C-alpha cells in the first residue's frame, strides 16, 4: 500500500559529490517525516538525519552534520540527500523510510530498496580468469575438487557458469577481496573421481559491465 523507490547504484571518484532520490506514494507526503539510514559492514547501521516535508524541518546527526544535506521537493514527491567530500569509508547502502505523523519518533515502518553508493578511483578493467587443475601426480581423495580464479575486474560483479549451467548444486560463490585497490574471485566444486581423467570440465566467467566473456579450458 506504501511503496518507496530509490535510485540505482552509483560510482564516483573520491572528492566529488553525489545526490540520491527517494520517491514514495500511498499516503499524504506532507504529513509524514522521512529518515535516512546508512548500513556499513558488516551489519553496522547509523542514522543520517530526518526531514519534515511541510516547509522544512531538519535534524542532523552531530557526526554527519557537515557531510550530508537534506532537501525535499513538495510538488513532485521526492527526498534527496547530497554528500560532500566523499572518501573511502563513506561507501555504504543508504535507506530512506517514512516516519510518524507529525513526529520523528515511533520508528520507521516502511523502508526503501537500499540503493548502494560506492566510491573508488580505480579504472574499470576487463577481467582475466585463472586456471586451476590437478596436480602433483597423485589424486586424493576419491573426491576431485577444483575451482576458478578471476583477477583485474571492476566494479562488481561477474557471473559464474559451469558447462553452460549443467550443475548448480556443488557450485559456490564468494564476495570480492580488496588487495591493492583491485578485487578477486574464487570458487570450489566438489566432484568425485569418475570425471577426470575421462570427462573434462572448463571454466567460463562473464562480466556484464565490461561485456567480457572469457572461457578457459581446465
Amino acid at each position: 500500500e506504501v511503496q518507496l523507490q530509490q535510485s540505482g547504484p552509483e560510482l564516483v571518484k573520491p572528492g566529488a559529490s553525489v545526490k540520491m532520490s527517494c520517491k514514495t506514494s500511498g499516503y499524504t507526503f506532507t504529513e509524514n517525516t522521512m529518515h535516512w539510514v546508512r548500513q556499513s559492514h558488516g551489519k553496522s547501521l547509523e542514522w543520517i538525519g530526518g526531514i519534515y516535508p511541510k516547509n522544512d524541518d531538519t535534524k542532523y546527526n552531530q557526526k554527519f552534520k557537515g557531510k550530508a544535506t537534506l532537501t525535499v521537493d513538495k510538488s513532485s514527491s521526492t527526498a534527496c540527500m547530497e554528500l560532500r567530500s566523499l572518501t573511502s569509508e563513506d561507501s555504504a547502502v543508504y535507506y530512506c523510510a517514512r516516519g510518524d505523523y507529525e513526529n520523528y519518533f515511533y520508528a520507521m515502518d516502511y523502508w526503501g530498496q537500499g540503493t548502494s553508493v560506492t566510491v573508488s578511483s580505480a579504472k574499470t578493467t576487463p577481467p582475466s580468469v585463472y586456471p586451476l587443475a590437478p596436480g602433483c601426480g597423485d589424486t586424493t581423495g576419491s573426491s576431485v575438487t577444483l575451482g576458478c580464479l578471476v583477477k583485474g575486474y571492476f566494479p562488481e560483479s561477474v557471473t559464474v557458469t559451469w558447462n553452460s549451467g549443467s550443475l548448480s548444486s556443488s557450485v559456490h560463490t564468494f564476495p570480492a577481496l580488496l588487495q591493492s585497490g583491485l578485487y578477486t574471485m574464487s570458487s570450489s566444486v566438489t566432484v568425485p573421481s569418475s570425471t577426470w581423467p575421462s570427462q573434462t570440465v572448463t571454466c567460463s566467467v562473464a562480466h556484464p559491465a565490461s561485456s567480457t566473456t572469457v572461457d578457459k579450458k581446465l
Binding site: 551489519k43 519518533f105 573426491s143 559456490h172 588487495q179
Partner: protein
C-alpha cells in the same frame, strides 16, 4: 549519546526452540524500543515497537517485553523463515542509535571440513606474481583459525580469507584463500603448508606440496 549493546552476537538455534535476545541502553528511556529483521540482501522490517506492541503483518509468535533500560525479545516458536539479523532502536534522544546486530542461524550437527590445497600454475608468473590457494568446504561451526607454515614461520601481513553465507538445504559454509606475493620470492623456499585448527580433531591434518611435484 546513548549506546546500546545486544547479546549474543551470533545465536545458532534449530527450528522449534525459544530464542531470547536482549538489548541494553546506557540511560533509561522507558518508552522506546524497535526490533528489526533484515534478511540477506533485503531491507529491514519492523517487528515489535514500543517494547511490547507488535506491528502489522507480524505473526503472533513474537512477544517483546521489558521496562527501564534492559529489554528483551522472545520468539516462540521459531519457524524456518525467521532467520536473519536483529536490531534495536531508541526513539528517546537524538541521534537515534542502533544495536550491533544479532545473527540467527540454524543449528546443525558436527561436520568434517573438506581439505583442499593446490600449487600455483605457470600462467600467473608472466604478470610478475604468484598466488597459491587453499580451500575448505562443508565445515561446521564457523569457528576456525588459519595457519600458514613456511619453514616453520608465520608471515604477516597478507594472510586473509573470505567465507560464504549459510545455504538453504546444505546450510554449510565455504572458505577461500588469496595471497599476494611476487614471482622471484616464490622460489626462495620450498615447503608450503596450509593448516586449519578446527574442533573436529585435536590434531589438525597436514597437507603440503613442493616445487617440481
Amino acid at each position: 549519546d546513548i549506546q546500546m549493546t545486544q547479546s549474543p552476537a551470533s545465536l545458532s538455534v534449530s527450528v522449534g526452540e525459544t530464542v531470547t535476545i536482549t538489548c541494553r541502553a546506557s540511560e533509561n528511556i522507558y518508552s522506546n524500543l524497535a526490533w528489526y529483521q533484515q534478511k540477506q540482501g533485503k531491507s529491514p522490517q519492523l517487528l515489535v515497537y514500543a517494547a511490547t506492541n507488535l506491528a502489522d503483518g507480524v505473526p503472533s509468535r513474537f512477544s517483546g517485553s521489558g521496562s527501564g533500560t534492559q529489554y528483551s525479545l522472545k520468539i516462540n516458536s521459531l519457524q524456518s523463515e525467521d532467520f536473519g539479523t536483529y536490531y534495536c532502536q531508541q526513539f528517546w534522544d537524538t541521534p537515534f542509535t542502533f544495536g550491533s546486530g544479532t545473527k540467527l542461524a540454524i543449528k546443525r550437527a558436527d561436520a568434517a571440513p573438506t581439505v583442499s590445497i593446490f600449487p600455483p600454475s605457470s600462467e600467473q608468473l608472466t604478470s610478475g606474481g604468484a598466488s597459491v590457494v587453499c580451500f575448505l568446504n562443508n565445515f561446521y561451526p564457523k569457528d576456525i583459525n588459519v595457519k600458514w607454515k613456511i619453514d616453520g614461520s608465520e608471515r604477516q601481513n597478507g594472510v586473509l580469507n573470505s567465507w560464504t553465507d549459510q545455504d538453504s538445504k546444505d546450510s554449510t559454509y565455504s572458505m577461500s584463500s588469496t595471497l599476494t606475493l611476487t614471482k622471484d620470492e616464490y622460489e626462495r623456499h620450498n615447503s608450503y603448508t596450509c593448516e586449519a585448527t578446527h574442533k573436529t580433531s585435536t590434531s589438525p591434518i597436514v597437507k603440503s606440496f613442493n616445487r617440481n611435484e
